[PDB]
Design a binder for this molecule. Sequence first.
Ligand SMILES: NCCc1c(-c2cccnc2)[nH]c2ccccc12
Ligand code: NI
Length: 315
Amino acid sequence: HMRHRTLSSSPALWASIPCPRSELRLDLVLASGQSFRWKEQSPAHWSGVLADQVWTLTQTEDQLYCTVYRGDDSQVSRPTLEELETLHKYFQLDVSLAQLYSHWASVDSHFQRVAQKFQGVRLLRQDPTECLFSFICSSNNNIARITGMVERLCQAFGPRLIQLDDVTYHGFPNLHALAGPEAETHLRKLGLGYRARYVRASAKAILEEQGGPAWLQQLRVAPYEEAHKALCTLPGVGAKVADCICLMALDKPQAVPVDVHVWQIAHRDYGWHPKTSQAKGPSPLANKELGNFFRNLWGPYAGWAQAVLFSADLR
Ligand SMILES: NCCc1c(-c2cccnc2)[nH]c2ccccc12
Ligand code: NI
């Protein structure tokens, strides 16, 4: 039956949020390593799952268009007000990106050069569960492969939502689903390798040691340093993965996930070398120190700044 919508196809089923392309570029955000669930199924039209619903999004120079599929054959209709608020929050559009960009440019001529061409890179505000398992899958991995891993994970363990053309969409599974006795064996069959063990074990630990997903919501209102440390008690989550989750899902805009790529940027583009430390390359301490350097430079939205450079570098 149902088909992926285009803005031309079905105008009566799309709504608009006023949004300049300088505040948000879909093509530098939806597949640049934050969410792994969005795909450009037709030119300029991006489809993906948000919270047990499927959306399609496209934009003009000043407008963000979106359409929702409920699927549970309710009648097709335009997105409601509440659904539009959900999306406004997902893209955190209350925060001005242009003001952050100049604040960062004012102390960083490197960022200023890169910013000319790479406008509209901002941070999604993601569901903690989804973000956590997605980033556990990110170790020694690339966007394309994580994307496949995550997609097979959701088809095997989470509820079916809808089909559009040849694509069946699933919701992200709950913890109890990933914690079960065959869960690791199954995930290895789905090609996750060693990451399969950390998926299952983290699901179990959140459930049994921490009281379920209410714990991730508590981390969202706890301070950065506290949330980061608590995530690092999980199987397969270290400083880098935990910083991703802090940045992308627990409202820690100052979190700077330090890996080999940010080391390369720091050294090449900024001339940084460890000072306090003397281990001349990556180390737990030198990586903490490099996160501090970026926070010191850019201020408390350092995580967002470094996001611009990541999307820039992916082209
Ligand atoms: N230094 C890149 C870290 C990273 C990110 C990332 C993206 C935006 C903002 N902050 C971090 N997405 C990834 C996907 C796979 C592997 C590593 C990453
Ligand atoms: Ni050097």
